[PDB]
Design a protein around this ligand. Structure first.
Ligand code: FMN
Ligand code: SF4
Ligand code: SF4
Ligand code: SF4
Ligand code: SF4
Ligand code: FES
Ligand code: FES
Ligand code: MG
Lengths: 59, 42, 62, 230, 217, 431
């Protein structure tokens, strides 16, 4: 259960798991997550910007 | 005599039998009422 | 990131009445413009109007 | 003249022909609704506005029921709460789990009314339905699996836009809203079907996936593209 | 369960908006007779009869037939499509020459309509909802057909065949494929809904006019 | 007093089973088109009084007072036409009485339409008949043509100075369009979904005009009630459940049939006398559905001493509706029968409103799992609760009728469901 450095995972197929839903940004107490999204070339809902300020995050 | 079936007239009915009779009844119909417009979208 | 230099950018105050809001603005000295409330006016609605003998309100579908 | 009705025991004078929903609006209560729009015709099919009259044994649809003299409307009654829970249970039982990937996420009337007048649990152990998406132009993106068959887009199309190209094809649980043929619903007022759809069945294609309602800041201005001054 | 039907239209060479369809002059006279059955200004009430007439003329209802009906009645093609998709007696894709419809509701199920269905399937070598290679028979399952006391039963192009057995339905299929037309009605020695054993009622001559007429009337 | 053993001289629907001529000559040989001019000249109020005194109730389902409904539509005119709509969309499983009446008493049906139209002040009568009855519709058209030629209808009907039109509308297959408001919508060429109430068909009906929707049996017995006196009709049957009724006995019975009887004949006597009894004997009986598929079922113990009238069947937690006895013996799967009924209601749902649409699909899936035991004993109460949620929250009565068989099955055969679930759970371990 230890919480350390953040990471973004992928599916076993290699596709990234994030679907650009911004619940990250909604629930982050410190507002350390900045997300910007647009439809991908194949039409998927994927992020174009995903930034985490580790000096602002409270882990 | 109550041992025979008298509803045998339906054994010779074409595909237009129902509509052919409707054409015959068009002469006996009373004039239809009018709502004052040709259609609800008029 | 989206930078700013206006301290009052996120400042939103809630007041119960226009009179209270105007009094607060006047006593704090900022300039202000007041917009009147736009309530939705009452409307006449009848479900039987969808099936009308001679009016155009008759619907073509449900 | 004006008749007298009661909402939760509070007297209110309403015009003849006024509905239970409008009487509740007069007294300050907002009855939950999915198919009712004040600028469209009455449908009465979503059944979310069922309220209990004080002595009547059967609940009535507030959006289509004219008020009678002396009626007492129990908006917060046990029967009303159970009816709302049942209707929401059916809607969410057939609804798909698409909230994170849906542009209607933070501004959905299904989510808000589920959290207010709905249950917090599901006893639906079966499989959900899936509907093939339609194409009605480059402005409106259709994901029809999220449609709750409220017929707002059909009524709006017909009455406001004068375009009778939307309708329900099918019967029963397989009833689908669409154009049947591949005709595109193109009009000068076609984004308002995006606005009036309570779910993410109709969503803005240019705005798709760009942002969420809680992030955006609202500035009230006027439109400058013609002389209407919208 | 699922019915395996699609309520969207994809244009095909066999079924496209440019498919040739038009009413014959006799059908136009029938349409004119039908329209006069409704008040003026409400000619949209004839959508069902006109669609049924188009289906009886063409065998089935193409999108061109729907558009022609809409054009004749001055009603939206979307409304015509709604009617056609809602009502199940309209064939939106071509069917066989004889449309066999076996009732599978509970009152017919109790009297072993599954035997009739299996007898039809084995005789024709087709599954439910499929059409024979010669495009001669189309077998489907339906709900109650209105003649429940005469169960099991099938409907073949507006004709009811009742009190069926596997042998009876096989004979019916043989007569149909032999070019003849079987006599509609029960095939178990009965004529109508009367009890098989005998007449438990109405065994006396009916009374004449004014049998129980009251004093005033 | 005991009810049953109806006499042929008092049976109304003569020429049933089609053993005589159904045409104009045969109808006039019996008591048809007799003193119709005198009835029309007596006029609306007298006919309504006769109907109310006879106490006729709706034969096509809910038994509302027909006299009361016709008095509701007996309001003064306001510049709009008036219509009597006869419902012959016999889509209820187990029912054939309307089909038999149309095929064998079309002149009686037409005379009843004329009498009802005169009573209500209606200019026209539309007979909406289901599309599967093509031959019945053709016979009805032939009878209507004969009446027009003989002058019994049309301009100056029966020589009484009253103009009255009769039309026949064939509707495609829609059990929901069998319903009165959905029938009104379907006559207007629309999709065929029921309307909300209010407005009622008396105020706003077909084409927006005052219409009264009445059953074939009701309109067909109306002229006989007017002629014989109505008091005789009230005398036949029990108190507030009076008259003659057509019962369609079918299922696991020796001689399935349709027969006319009194309004309070006991179910066991009816089955054993006019149907030959249950196959394998009465002791082999398992369940009986008294009305159509909408009415709940009852076990053998209740069926042992139950009467076939509205109030008696209501006391048995079921209803009468369309009197259509469906008999199931002990050699059948009651769960499978109820599942088939729920599947029927799923296919026939018009899909307009959420409770019936979603909940009926849900109950169909739950029953489909129940028939094989692939469920849990805790899901029976969940099915009961969802059926209760469907009932009373729908636009029309099909949603209510889709939950009553489920409630009856849960109420009277819960041990069967639990035993089936236990058997499935045990067989799962066998792998
Ligand atoms: C042949 C027939 C079919 C009916 N089918 C339905 C139905 O599917 N659903 C329903 O709610 N009512 C149904 N009804 C009842 C109608 O809503 C209505 O009560 C009836 O047509 C007229 O009432 P009455 O019995 O007083 O004449 C049916 C009635 C008839 C005669
Ligand atoms: S934005 Fe949503 S989907 Fe993406 S990582 Fe955060 S919570 Fe997960
Ligand atoms: S329409 Fe509403 S309930 Fe449905 S997936 Fe979108 S946010 Fe969720
Ligand atoms: S697409 Fe939206 S507006 Fe149209 S019926 Fe469905 S939920 Fe209602
Ligand atoms: S209860 Fe069912 S059949 Fe009746 S209006 Fe609602 S969806 Fe249609
Ligand atoms: S808001 Fe009234 S039924 Fe939908
Ligand atoms: S149940 Fe089959 S004809 Fe009615
Ligand atoms: Mg939307």
């Amino acid at each position: 259960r230890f919480r350390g450095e953040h990471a973004l995972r992928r599916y076993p197929s290699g596709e990234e798991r994030c679907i650009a839903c911004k619940l990250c940004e909604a629930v982050c107490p410190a507002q350390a997550i900045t997300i910007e999204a647009e439809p991908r070339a194949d039409g998927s809902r994927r992020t174009t910007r995903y930034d985490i300020d580790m000096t602002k995050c409270i882990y | 005599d109550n041992s025979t079936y008298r509803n045998l007239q339906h054994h010779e009915y074409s595909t237009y039998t129902f509509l052919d009779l409707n054409v015959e009844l068009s002469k006996f119909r009373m004039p239809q009422p009018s709502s004052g417009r040709q259609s609800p979208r008029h | 990131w989206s930078s700013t230099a206006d301290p009052l950018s996120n400042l939103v105050l809630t007041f119960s009445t226009k009179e209270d809001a105007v009094a607060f603005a006047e006593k704090n000295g900022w300039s202000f413009d007041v917009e009147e409330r736009k309530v939705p006016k009452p409307k006449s609605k009848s479900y039987g109007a969808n099936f009308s003998w001679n009016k155009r309100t008759r619907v073509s579908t449900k | 003249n004006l008749i007298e009705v009661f909402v939760d025991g509070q007297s209110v004078m309403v015009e003849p022909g006024t509905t239970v929903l409008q009487a509740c609006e007069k007294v300050g209560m907002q009855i939950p609704r999915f198919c009712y729009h004040e600028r469209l015709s009455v449908a009465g099919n979503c059944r979310m506005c069922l309220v209990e009259i004080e002595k009547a044994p059967k609940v009535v649809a507030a959006c289509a029921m004219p008020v009678m003299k002396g009626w007492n409307i129990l908006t917060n009654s046990e029967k009303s709460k159970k009816a709302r829970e049942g209707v929401m249970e059916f809607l969410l039982a057939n609804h798909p789990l698409d909230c994170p990937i849906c542009d209607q996420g933070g501004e959905c009337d299904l989510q808000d009314q589920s959290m207010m007048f709905g249950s917090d649990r599901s006893r639906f152990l079966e499989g959900k339905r899936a509907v093939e998406d339609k194409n009605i132009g480059p402005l409106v993106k259709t994901i029809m699996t999220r449609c709750i068959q409220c017929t707002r887009c059909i009524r709006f199309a017909s009455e406001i836009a004068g375009v009778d190209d939307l309708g329900t094809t099918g019967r029963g649980n397989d009833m689908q809203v669409g154009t049947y043929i591949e005709k595109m619903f193109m009009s000068e007022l076609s984004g308002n079907i995006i606005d009036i759809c309570p779910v993410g069945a109709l969503t803005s294609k240019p705005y798709a996936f760009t942002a969420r309602p809680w992030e955006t800041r609202k500035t009230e201005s006027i439109d400058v593209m013609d002389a209407v001054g919208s | 369960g699922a019915g395996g039907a699609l309520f969207v239209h994809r244009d095909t060479p066999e079924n496209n908006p440019d498919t040739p369809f038009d009413f014959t002059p006799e059908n136009y006279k029938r349409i004119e007779a039908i329209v006069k059955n409704y008040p003026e200004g409400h000619k949209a009430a004839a959508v069902l009869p006109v669609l049924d007439l188009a289906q009886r003329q063409n065998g089935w209802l193409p999108i061109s037939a729907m558009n022609k009906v809409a054009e004749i009645l001055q009603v939206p093609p979307m409304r015509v499509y709604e009617v056609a998709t809602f009502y199940t007696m309209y064939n939106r894709k071509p069917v066989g020459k004889y449309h066999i419809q076996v009732c599978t509701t509970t009152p017919c199920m109790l009297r072993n309509s599954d035997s009739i269905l299996e007898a039809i399937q084995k005789k024709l070598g087709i599954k439910v909802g499929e059409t024979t290679p010669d495009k001669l028979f189309t077998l489907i399952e339906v709900e109650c057909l209105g003649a429940c006391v005469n169960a099991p039963m099938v409907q073949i192009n507006d004709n009811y065949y009742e009190d069926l057995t596997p042998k009876d339905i096989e004979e019916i299929i043989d007569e149909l494929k032999a070019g003849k037309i079987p006599k509609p009605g029960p095939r178990s020695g009965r004529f109508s809904c009367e009890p098989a054993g005998g007449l438990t009622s109405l065994t006396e001559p009916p009374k004449g006019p004014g049998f129980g007429v009251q004093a005033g009337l | 007093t005991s009810f049953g053993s109806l006499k042929d001289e008092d049976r109304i629907f003569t020429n049933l089973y089609g053993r005589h001529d159904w045409r104009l000559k045969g109808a006039q040989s019996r008591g048809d088109w007799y003193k119709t001019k005198e009835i029309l000249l007596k006029g609306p109020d007298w006919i309504l009084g006769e109907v109310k005194t006879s106490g006729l109730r709706g034969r096509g389902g809910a038994g509302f007072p027909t006299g009361l409904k016709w008095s509701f539509m007996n309001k003064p005119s306001d510049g709009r036409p008036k219509y009597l709509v006869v419902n012959a969309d016999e889509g209820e499983p187990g029912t054939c009485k309307d089909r038999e009446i149309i095929r064998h008493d079309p002149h009686k049906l037409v005379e009843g339409c004329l009498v009802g139209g005169r009573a209500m002040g209606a200019r026209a009568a539309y007979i909406y008949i289901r599309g599967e009855f093509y031959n019945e519709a053709s016979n009805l058209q032939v009878a209507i043509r004969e009446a027009y030629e003989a002058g019994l209808i049309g301009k100056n009907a029966c020589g009484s100075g009253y103009d009255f039109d009769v039309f026949v509308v064939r509707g495609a297959g829609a059990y929901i369009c069998g319903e009165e408001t959905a029938l009104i919508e379907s006559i207007e060429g629309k999709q065929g979904k029921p309307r909300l109430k209010p407005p009622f068909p008396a105020d706003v009906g077909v084409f927006g005009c005052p219409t009264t929707v009445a059953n074939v049996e009701t309109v067909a017995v109306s002229p006989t009630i007017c002629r014989r006196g109505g008091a005789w009709f009230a005398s036949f049957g029990r108190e507030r459940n009076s008259g003659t009724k057509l019962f369609n006995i079918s299922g696991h019975v020796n001689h399935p049939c349709t027969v006319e009887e009194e309004m309070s004949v006991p179910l066991k006597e009816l089955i054993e006398k006019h149907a030959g009894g249950v196959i394998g004997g009465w002791d082999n009986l398992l369940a009986v559905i008294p009305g159509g598929s909408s009415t709940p079922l009852i076990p053998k113990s209740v069926c042992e001493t139950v009467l076939m009238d509205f109030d008696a069947l209501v006391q048995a937690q079921t209803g009468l509706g369309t009197a259509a006895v469906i008999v199931m013996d002990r050699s059948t799967d009651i769960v499978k029968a109820i599942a088939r009924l729920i599947e029927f209601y799923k296919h026939e749902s018009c899909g307009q409103c959420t409770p019936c649409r979603e909940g009926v699909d849900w109950m169909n899936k739950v029953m489909a799992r129940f028939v094989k035991g692939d469920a849990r004993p805790a899901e029976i109460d969940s099915l009961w609760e969802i059926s209760k949620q469907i009932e009373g929250h729908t636009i029309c009565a099909l949603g209510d009728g889709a939950a009553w068989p489920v409630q009856g099955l849960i109420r009277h055969f819960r041990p069967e469901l639990e035993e089936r679930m236990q058997q499935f759970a045990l067989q799962h371990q066998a792998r």
